[PDB]
Amino acid sequence: GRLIYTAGGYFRQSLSYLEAYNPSDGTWLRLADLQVPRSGLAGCVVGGLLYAVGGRNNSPDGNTDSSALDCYNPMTNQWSPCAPMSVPRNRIGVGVIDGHIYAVGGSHGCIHHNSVERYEPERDEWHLVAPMLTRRIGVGVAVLNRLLYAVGGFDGTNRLNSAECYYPERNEWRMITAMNTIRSGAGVCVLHNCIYAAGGYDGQDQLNSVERYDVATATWTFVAPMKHRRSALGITVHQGRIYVLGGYDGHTFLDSVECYDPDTDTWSEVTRMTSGRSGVGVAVT
Ligand SMILES: CC(=O)N1CCC[C@H]1C(=O)N[C@@H]1COC(=O)c2ccccc2CSC[C@H](C(=O)N(C)C)NC1=O
Ligand SMILES: [Cl-]
Ligand code: NA
Numbered sequence: 001g002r003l004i005y006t007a008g009g010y011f012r013q014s015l016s017y018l019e020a021y022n023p024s025d026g027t028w029l030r031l032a033d034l035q036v037p038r039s040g041l042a043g044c045v046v047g048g049l050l051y052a053v054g055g056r057n058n059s060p061d062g063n064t065d066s067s068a069l070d071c072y073n074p075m076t077n078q079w080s081p082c083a084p085m086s087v088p089r090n091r092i093g094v095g096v097i098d099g100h101i102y103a104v105g106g107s108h109g110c111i112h113h114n115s116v117e118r119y120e121p122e123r124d125e126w127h128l129v130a131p132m133l134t135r136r137i138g139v140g141v142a143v144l145n146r147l148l149y150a151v152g153g154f155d156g157t158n159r160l161n162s163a164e165c166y167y168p169e170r171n172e173w174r175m176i177t178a179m180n181t182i183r184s185g186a187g188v189c190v191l192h193n194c195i196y197a198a199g200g201y202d203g204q205d206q207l208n209s210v211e212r213y214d215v216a217t218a219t220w221t222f223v224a225p226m227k228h229r230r231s232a233l234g235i236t237v238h239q240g241r242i243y244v245l246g247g248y249d250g251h252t253f254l255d256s257v258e259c260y261d262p263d264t265d266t267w268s269e270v271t272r273m274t275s276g277r278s279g280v281g282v283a284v285t
Contacts, residue, residue, distance in 0.1 A: 002238065003284070004238055004245075004282065005018065005020050005283050006246075006273065007038075007072075007281040007283075008041050009278060010278050014039040014279075015038075016033035016036075016038075017274075019273070023238055026271060032078060032079060036066070038055035038281075039278065040055045043234075046121050049071050052072070054085065054089035054090060067087055067089065068081070082124060083125055085119075086115075089103055090107045102116060102117070102118050102129070105153060106139075114132045116128070129171060133164050133173050134164065137154050138152070138186075138200075138201075138231075140152055144190050149188075154184040160183075162175065164176060177213070184201045186200030186207075187230075187234065188235065189236065189237050191241075195213040196212045196213075196223070197210070197220075199231055199244070200231050205229065207229055223262075224266055224267055226244060226267050228254060230246070236282045236283065242262075245280060246280055248279075253276040254276050254278070255272045255273040256269060257270055
């Protein structure tokens with residue numbers, strides 16, 4: 001019985017919510033709040049423990065970018081602080097390889113990072129690895145074939161359709177086939193050996209289009225679009241299906257939770273979050 005966790009987000013200000021969705025019975029659990037509110041964070045799971053990485057606390061009286069790493073234990077309902085990253089990283093992308101968390105790009109005020117760092121839970125340490133070829137904030141990260149992909153984003157001047165690949169053994173990045181659409185703040189995940197890029201912002205409007213990367217053919221193909229246009233959406237894979245949580249449609253902060261079935265190439269609304277929000281960190285455990 002695995003749950004879909006949603007941490008943080010934004011609705012008028014950065015949020016502290018930690019909530020878990022049970023896709024089996026349709027219930028929502030209210031868990032212990034994050035110690036510091038945060039949006040533009042990323043979530044991941046290492047050894048049954050949930051991690052909230054980077055982000056920013058936007059308050060009506062002041063904004064603070066986050067270098068924080070926090071760990072949630074589902075068994076104890078407690079958040080524990082971990083070692084912080086070298087730099088604050090808002091609109092961060094995260095990926096896990098061999099129980100190691102990679103923190104990809106993000107922003108610190110005026111700085112758009114191309115830098116990448118790796119966390120070792122066993123040692124409680126961050127170390128910088130090779131930086132990306134492109135500075136990317138609002139970047140989608142996916143782990144496929146023990147390689148780390150950085151998809152789309154914004155480099156400080158331009159919204160990107162470009163994507164690159166990290167080889168951990170060789171400690172190097174290579175540019176891959178670019179997407180058909182420019183996407184900053186897309187939901188990026190792996191399902192059945194493919195990378196999916198859902199939604200985002202093309203520099204003009206929020207997108208409902210979804211495309212998947214096939215590694216054997218090195219091509220991006222459009223699949224069924226979502227019912228709602230969304231950027232800063234949370235994304236996860238649970239039991240062979242993609243779940244997209246909340247996001248921003250250009251006016252409204254969505255509470256809508258859509259589910260993609262690859263067998264039928266269809267999206268459907270499965271639930272509603274307790275409240276609408278964007279820039280949530282999502283993981284399954
Ligand atoms: C830049 C901006 O506007 N502001 C002004 C104050 C704070 C910030 C804001 O509001 N951010 C939140 C949070 O989103 C995110 O964490 C996020 C996460 C990943 C990628 C992209 C995003 C942005 S999604 C775009 C949407 C927007 O532009 N609004 C509301 C006008 N911003 C939001 O929802
Ligand atoms: Cl933001
Ligand atoms: Na490739």
